[PDB]
mmCIF file of C-alpha atoms in Angstrom:
data_model
loop_
_atom_site.group_PDB
_atom_site.id
_atom_site.type_symbol
_atom_site.label_atom_id
_atom_site.label_comp_id
_atom_site.label_asym_id
_atom_site.label_seq_id
_atom_site.Cartn_x
_atom_site.Cartn_y
_atom_site.Cartn_z
ATOM 1 C CA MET A 1 11.377 -22.838 -25.270
ATOM 2 C CA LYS A 2 12.764 -21.992 -28.726
ATOM 3 C CA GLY A 3 14.292 -18.587 -29.392
ATOM 4 C CA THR A 4 11.700 -17.383 -31.854
ATOM 5 C CA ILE A 5 8.890 -17.115 -29.275
ATOM 6 C CA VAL A 6 11.045 -15.874 -26.400
ATOM 7 C CA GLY A 7 12.281 -13.077 -28.666
ATOM 8 C CA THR A 8 8.694 -11.937 -29.122
ATOM 9 C CA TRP A 9 8.211 -12.105 -25.342
ATOM 10 C CA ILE A 10 11.056 -9.691 -24.570
ATOM 11 C CA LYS A 11 9.685 -7.140 -27.047
ATOM 12 C CA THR A 12 6.163 -7.568 -25.706
ATOM 13 C CA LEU A 13 7.364 -7.216 -22.112
ATOM 14 C CA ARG A 14 9.195 -4.006 -23.019
ATOM 15 C CA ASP A 15 6.040 -2.668 -24.694
ATOM 16 C CA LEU A 16 3.883 -3.453 -21.662
ATOM 17 C CA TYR A 17 6.199 -2.704 -18.791
ATOM 18 C CA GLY A 18 9.066 -0.477 -19.977
ATOM 19 C CA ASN A 19 12.809 -0.941 -20.304
ATOM 20 C CA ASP A 20 13.735 -0.574 -16.634
ATOM 21 C CA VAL A 21 11.498 -3.450 -15.560
ATOM 22 C CA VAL A 22 12.709 -5.666 -18.387
ATOM 23 C CA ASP A 23 16.442 -4.889 -18.145
ATOM 24 C CA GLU A 24 16.387 -5.683 -14.427
ATOM 25 C CA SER A 25 14.270 -8.810 -14.878
ATOM 26 C CA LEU A 26 16.610 -10.206 -17.563
ATOM 27 C CA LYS A 27 19.618 -9.336 -15.397
ATOM 28 C CA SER A 28 18.105 -11.307 -12.504
ATOM 29 C CA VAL A 29 18.699 -14.612 -14.350
ATOM 30 C CA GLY A 30 22.210 -13.766 -15.493
ATOM 31 C CA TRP A 31 21.400 -12.412 -18.965
ATOM 32 C CA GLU A 32 22.703 -9.116 -20.311
ATOM 33 C CA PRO A 33 19.932 -6.506 -19.841
ATOM 34 C CA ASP A 34 19.924 -5.867 -23.608
ATOM 35 C CA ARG A 35 20.069 -9.491 -24.676
ATOM 36 C CA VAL A 36 18.750 -10.166 -28.156
ATOM 37 C CA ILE A 37 17.342 -13.677 -28.398
ATOM 38 C CA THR A 38 17.686 -15.312 -31.821
ATOM 39 C CA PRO A 39 15.350 -17.903 -33.364
ATOM 40 C CA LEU A 40 17.406 -21.087 -33.058
ATOM 41 C CA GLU A 41 18.485 -20.744 -29.418
ATOM 42 C CA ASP A 42 17.142 -23.084 -26.750
ATOM 43 C CA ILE A 43 15.980 -20.980 -23.846
ATOM 44 C CA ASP A 44 15.640 -22.635 -20.429
ATOM 45 C CA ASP A 45 11.965 -22.624 -19.402
ATOM 46 C CA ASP A 46 12.977 -22.112 -15.768
ATOM 47 C CA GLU A 47 14.880 -18.962 -16.695
ATOM 48 C CA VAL A 48 11.737 -17.684 -18.407
ATOM 49 C CA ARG A 49 9.764 -18.555 -15.297
ATOM 50 C CA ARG A 50 12.192 -16.546 -13.142
ATOM 51 C CA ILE A 51 12.130 -13.558 -15.502
ATOM 52 C CA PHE A 52 8.348 -13.389 -15.302
ATOM 53 C CA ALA A 53 8.497 -13.772 -11.527
ATOM 54 C CA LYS A 54 10.749 -10.700 -11.408
ATOM 55 C CA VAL A 55 8.424 -8.765 -13.714
ATOM 56 C CA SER A 56 5.635 -9.723 -11.339
ATOM 57 C CA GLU A 57 7.636 -8.457 -8.349
ATOM 58 C CA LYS A 58 8.578 -5.134 -9.954
ATOM 59 C CA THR A 59 5.098 -4.324 -11.283
ATOM 60 C CA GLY A 60 3.046 -5.654 -8.392
ATOM 61 C CA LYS A 61 0.941 -7.787 -10.755
ATOM 62 C CA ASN A 62 0.753 -11.519 -10.141
ATOM 63 C CA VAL A 63 2.478 -13.864 -12.593
ATOM 64 C CA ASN A 64 -0.762 -15.195 -14.060
ATOM 65 C CA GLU A 65 -1.851 -11.616 -14.762
ATOM 66 C CA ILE A 66 1.468 -10.910 -16.506
ATOM 67 C CA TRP A 67 1.060 -13.970 -18.734
ATOM 68 C CA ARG A 68 -2.476 -12.927 -19.626
ATOM 69 C CA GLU A 69 -1.359 -9.406 -20.581
ATOM 70 C CA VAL A 70 1.623 -10.768 -22.517
ATOM 71 C CA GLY A 71 -0.646 -13.182 -24.412
ATOM 72 C CA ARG A 72 -2.954 -10.301 -25.371
ATOM 73 C CA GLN A 73 -0.123 -8.023 -26.463
ATOM 74 C CA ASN A 74 2.000 -10.685 -28.137
ATOM 75 C CA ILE A 75 -0.534 -10.940 -30.962
ATOM 76 C CA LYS A 76 0.483 -7.444 -32.073
ATOM 77 C CA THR A 77 4.150 -8.457 -32.038
ATOM 78 C CA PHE A 78 3.286 -11.559 -34.079
ATOM 79 C CA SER A 79 1.289 -9.476 -36.554
ATOM 80 C CA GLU A 80 4.398 -7.307 -37.045
ATOM 81 C CA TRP A 81 7.109 -10.001 -37.127
ATOM 82 C CA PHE A 82 5.118 -12.757 -38.836
ATOM 83 C CA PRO A 83 2.396 -10.977 -40.844
ATOM 84 C CA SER A 84 1.841 -13.957 -43.171
ATOM 85 C CA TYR A 85 -0.349 -15.663 -40.556
ATOM 86 C CA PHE A 86 -2.599 -12.594 -40.329
ATOM 87 C CA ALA A 87 -3.514 -11.949 -43.981
ATOM 88 C CA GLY A 88 -6.841 -13.750 -43.498
ATOM 89 C CA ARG A 89 -10.151 -11.950 -43.134
ATOM 90 C CA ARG A 90 -11.859 -13.651 -40.192
ATOM 91 C CA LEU A 91 -10.947 -14.398 -36.610
ATOM 92 C CA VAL A 92 -12.891 -17.676 -36.769
ATOM 93 C CA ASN A 93 -10.685 -19.070 -39.560
ATOM 94 C CA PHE A 94 -7.514 -17.808 -37.901
ATOM 95 C CA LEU A 95 -8.445 -19.746 -34.741
ATOM 96 C CA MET A 96 -9.478 -22.892 -36.636
ATOM 97 C CA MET A 97 -6.112 -23.092 -38.367
ATOM 98 C CA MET A 98 -3.972 -22.599 -35.278
ATOM 99 C CA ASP A 99 -3.490 -26.284 -34.504
ATOM 100 C CA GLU A 100 -2.244 -26.832 -38.065
ATOM 101 C CA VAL A 101 0.029 -23.766 -37.912
ATOM 102 C CA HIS A 102 1.632 -25.072 -34.713
ATOM 103 C CA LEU A 103 1.955 -28.620 -36.114
ATOM 104 C CA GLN A 104 3.806 -27.087 -39.089
ATOM 105 C CA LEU A 105 6.107 -25.116 -36.805
ATOM 106 C CA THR A 106 7.013 -28.379 -35.148
ATOM 107 C CA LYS A 107 7.985 -29.950 -38.491
ATOM 108 C CA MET A 108 9.788 -26.825 -39.768
ATOM 109 C CA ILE A 109 11.562 -25.746 -36.572
ATOM 110 C CA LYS A 110 14.040 -28.107 -34.913
ATOM 111 C CA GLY A 111 13.024 -28.767 -31.303
ATOM 112 C CA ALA A 112 9.803 -26.721 -31.324
ATOM 113 C CA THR A 113 7.131 -28.162 -29.019
ATOM 114 C CA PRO A 114 3.973 -26.004 -29.261
ATOM 115 C CA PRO A 115 0.681 -27.236 -27.743
ATOM 116 C CA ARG A 116 -2.222 -28.907 -29.559
ATOM 117 C CA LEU A 117 -4.994 -26.366 -30.194
ATOM 118 C CA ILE A 118 -7.699 -28.533 -31.742
ATOM 119 C CA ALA A 119 -10.763 -26.490 -32.640
ATOM 120 C CA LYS A 120 -14.194 -27.401 -33.991
ATOM 121 C CA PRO A 121 -17.451 -25.577 -34.748
ATOM 122 C CA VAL A 122 -20.154 -26.344 -32.164
ATOM 123 C CA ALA A 123 -22.959 -23.863 -32.948
ATOM 124 C CA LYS A 124 -23.969 -21.150 -35.406
ATOM 125 C CA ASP A 125 -21.987 -18.600 -33.421
ATOM 126 C CA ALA A 126 -19.400 -20.700 -31.598
ATOM 127 C CA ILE A 127 -16.388 -22.963 -31.769
ATOM 128 C CA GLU A 128 -14.596 -25.031 -29.116
ATOM 129 C CA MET A 129 -10.824 -25.050 -28.736
ATOM 130 C CA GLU A 130 -8.820 -27.212 -26.364
ATOM 131 C CA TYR A 131 -5.363 -26.314 -25.196
ATOM 132 C CA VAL A 132 -3.339 -29.461 -24.594
ATOM 133 C CA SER A 133 0.239 -29.223 -23.445
ATOM 134 C CA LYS A 134 3.031 -30.808 -21.467
ATOM 135 C CA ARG A 135 3.597 -27.229 -20.271
ATOM 136 C CA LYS A 136 1.041 -25.227 -18.331
ATOM 137 C CA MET A 137 0.417 -21.778 -19.757
ATOM 138 C CA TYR A 138 -3.294 -21.316 -19.246
ATOM 139 C CA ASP A 139 -3.304 -17.516 -18.929
ATOM 140 C CA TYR A 140 -0.982 -17.053 -21.910
ATOM 141 C CA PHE A 141 -3.305 -19.225 -24.019
ATOM 142 C CA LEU A 142 -6.368 -17.235 -22.977
ATOM 143 C CA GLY A 143 -4.604 -13.926 -23.535
ATOM 144 C CA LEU A 144 -3.587 -14.878 -27.078
ATOM 145 C CA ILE A 145 -7.193 -15.609 -27.943
ATOM 146 C CA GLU A 146 -8.249 -12.249 -26.492
ATOM 147 C CA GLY A 147 -5.414 -10.534 -28.365
ATOM 148 C CA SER A 148 -6.619 -12.160 -31.578
ATOM 149 C CA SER A 149 -10.118 -10.803 -31.017
ATOM 150 C CA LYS A 150 -8.577 -7.350 -30.701
ATOM 151 C CA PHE A 151 -6.413 -7.638 -33.820
ATOM 152 C CA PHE A 152 -9.288 -8.856 -35.977
ATOM 153 C CA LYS A 153 -11.614 -6.297 -34.364
ATOM 154 C CA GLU A 154 -14.224 -8.996 -33.739
ATOM 155 C CA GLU A 155 -16.045 -9.342 -30.430
ATOM 156 C CA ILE A 156 -16.064 -12.722 -28.723
ATOM 157 C CA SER A 157 -16.928 -14.249 -25.373
ATOM 158 C CA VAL A 158 -14.440 -16.863 -24.184
ATOM 159 C CA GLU A 159 -16.064 -19.330 -21.806
ATOM 160 C CA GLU A 160 -13.762 -21.685 -19.945
ATOM 161 C CA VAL A 161 -15.436 -25.089 -19.781
ATOM 162 C CA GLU A 162 -12.751 -27.434 -18.402
ATOM 163 C CA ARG A 163 -9.335 -27.108 -16.811
ATOM 164 C CA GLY A 164 -7.121 -29.755 -15.250
ATOM 165 C CA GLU A 165 -4.172 -32.108 -15.572
ATOM 166 C CA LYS A 166 -4.492 -35.663 -16.846
ATOM 167 C CA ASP A 167 -1.776 -38.190 -17.632
ATOM 168 C CA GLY A 168 1.016 -35.648 -17.925
ATOM 169 C CA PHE A 169 -0.998 -33.117 -19.924
ATOM 170 C CA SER A 170 -2.427 -29.746 -18.966
ATOM 171 C CA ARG A 171 -5.784 -29.278 -20.678
ATOM 172 C CA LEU A 172 -8.030 -26.262 -20.977
ATOM 173 C CA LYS A 173 -11.211 -26.323 -23.070
ATOM 174 C CA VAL A 174 -12.907 -23.057 -24.084
ATOM 175 C CA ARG A 175 -16.142 -22.321 -25.894
ATOM 176 C CA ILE A 176 -15.713 -19.200 -28.002
ATOM 177 C CA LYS A 177 -18.900 -17.361 -28.894
ATOM 178 C CA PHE A 178 -18.779 -14.758 -31.646
ATOM 179 C CA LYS A 179 -20.915 -11.626 -31.408
ATOM 180 C CA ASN A 180 -21.525 -12.053 -35.130
ATOM 181 C CA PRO A 181 -22.439 -15.668 -36.131
ATOM 182 C CA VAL A 182 -19.755 -17.632 -38.010
ATOM 183 C CA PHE A 183 -22.095 -19.682 -40.186
ATOM 184 C CA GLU A 184 -22.832 -18.615 -43.768
ATOM 185 C CA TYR A 185 -26.097 -16.625 -43.923
#
């Protein structure tokens, strides 16, 4: 993973779980407890895995639960560190532009490999988004969507429609129903 995202993760983990849990989790993979991760670093995905496993152990929450909570909370961190992506007025448009935003990160950040997040309108009050990745971060993905709902203060129902691996790719399709219709009345 690139340094820019992992940096946000450390902050988010501190905010959720406190400094003791995070210091000790970082230490467990050989890092200084107060490590500051900078945007251009390449961070070993397996070291991230092991950090989260230690967070899981110390909190008594399973790893999938941690990723879900981190996805939810990381939206706040994003809104603070990268507010330009959050100047829009509607959750629906934010979600619809995510695939493009991540494609642009790829082109503008050496070595970045974010997932595809293709999203299309499917009904007056719903869109579909499909997570497609060589990685497998289903709970993180779901949590980010939930976190986005919270930031925009817009109620949604996220229905998981498909999940599975095919030809090297993890894929998760959701149908996102908005309490208030998205179409123009």
